[PDB]
C-alpha cells in the first residue's frame, strides 16, 4: 500500500515527518488515512465512542501524553476498531497484549507496551489540535505510516 | 500460557508491575513461576550453580546490575536451564547468542546483548532482596511475563 | 556465517567490542570481511560510488555522525551492494525502506530508521579513521556481525 520513504522523495517539504519514536504493534505494515485526533491521559474511553465508528479511510491519532505507564489500546479495543475497518491507529501511548495485536487487519504505531490497561472514565477531548514527535496534527490531515516511519500531509498523496 | 493483561485486569493492585525496561529472547513467549532471587555483575559463577540444579516450577531472577557490557546468559548456560526444567529467566543485565537463545524451549528476559561473557570466578549472593524496574523481587515470590510486560506477586495467581 | 560471542571468547583482548548501539536490518542475520571506511553526514553519493565496486569479501563501515535525521540506505542503493556482492553495511546513521531490506540477501547494521533521503551531494571522504560506539575503525580491519552485536579486529578471524 505505502511506501513513506518514497513519498518523502516524491513530496519533499510538503510533509512533516514524526520522530522516530514508533514501533508497528499491528498486523498491518503500512496504513494511510485523513486524521481524527484525540488528547487524553491514561484513558481510552473517549476512543471507546470513537472506535464505534466508521472509520474506514480514517486514521486515529491520539495524544496519550507519551505514558508507557498505562496501556490505552488492547485486544477488546483494537478487534472493534477492525471490525468498523479503521486504517490504523497512532498512540503516543502505550498499548497491550502484543501477540493479539500482530494478528489484526489494523496499524497500530505506539511508544511502549505495559500489561496495565486505562481508566474508562471517557476523559479528554476528540478533534482538537495536538503535538508530538514535532509534528502537530490536525483532525481533517493525512497520515502515511509504514515500518520505516510515519508521515503528515495538509492534504492527501496518493 | 499467560496474558500479563489479563492478570493486570482481574488482580489489580494485588499484582506489582515492572518498568517495560525488557524484551524477550526466549523461545517461550510466556512464562511464570515462583522466583529464585540472585544478585551478581558481570559473573555467571552462581548462575551455573543454580541451573545445574532442577528448576521445574521456578523462574531465576537476576540482579545483574543492568550491565550491557558482559553477558550473563548464553547458549550453554540455557541449554543447561532448559534440560533442568527451569521455566525462565528474568535478566537485568545482557544475554548472548540471541539466535541461539530463540530457539530454546525457556522463557528468558533481558534488557540487551552483548557478545562478550561474564567471567565464571562465583562471585555474587542469592535468595537476596533484589530491585530494579521499578520492582523489589524475594525468593518466594510468583512472576509472570508475556511480550506484553513483566508482573510479580506474593501469591500464586490463577 | 559468524557467531560473535563464539569469536570473543577465542580471541578475548584481540577484539574491539561496539557499543550496542545497532540492529538488523538486512536479509543476513550475519557477516563480516574486510572494511572499507566512509565518514560523511546526511549524505550517500559517495557511497554510490563505493558500493558501485566489487565488494565480495567486504564491509562498507559508514561513519555518518549518527544522524537519525535523513537516511543513507535505502532499497535503491542496498540492492546494488547486493548485486556488486558487499558482505554488508554497518552504517552509524539510520536507514529507510525496511521492510524492502529485510528481503536482501546482505547484513544491514544501523541505527535507526527514517523515511527521508539523505543528500546526493557527494561530500565525504574515504578511507579514513573513524571512530563511533566506543571503537575506531581502520580499512583494512576486520567485522564480524549478527543480532547478538558486531565486533572489529585487526586481522582475520577465519
Chains 1, 2, 3 share one sequence.
Not at 505506539?110 to 514535532?134: C, K, L, T, Y
Not at 483532525?139 to 516511519?149: C, F, P, R
Amino acid at each position: 500500500k505505502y511506501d513513506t520513504s518514497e513519498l518523502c522523495d516524491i513530496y519533499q517539504e510538503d510533509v512533516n515527518v514524526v520522530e522516530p519514536l514508533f514501533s508497528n504493534f499491528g498486523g498491518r505494515a503500512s496504513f494511510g488515512g485523513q486524521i481524527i485526533t484525540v488528547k487524553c491521559f491514561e484513558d481510552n474511553g473517549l476512543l471507546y465512542d470513537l472506535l464505534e465508528q466508521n472509520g474506514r479511510g480514517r486514521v486515529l491519532v491520539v495524544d496519550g501524553g507519551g505514558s508507557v505507564r498505562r496501556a490505552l489500546v488492547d485486544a477488546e479495543l483494537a478487534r472493534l476498531a477492525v471490525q468498523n475497518e479503521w486504517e490504523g491507529l497512532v498512540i503516543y501511548g502505550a498499548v497491550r497484549q502484543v501477540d493479539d495485536l500482530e494478528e489484526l487487519d489494523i496499524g497500530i504505531q505506539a511508544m511502549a507496551a505495559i500489561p496495565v490497561g486505562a481508566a474508562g472514565e471517557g476523559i479528554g477531548e476528540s478533534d482538537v489540535r495536538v503535538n508530538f514527535g514535532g509534528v502537530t496534527f490536525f483532525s481533517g490531515d493525512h497520515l502515511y505510516a509504514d515500518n520505516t516511519g510515519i508521515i503528515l500531509s495538509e492534504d492527501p498523496l496518493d
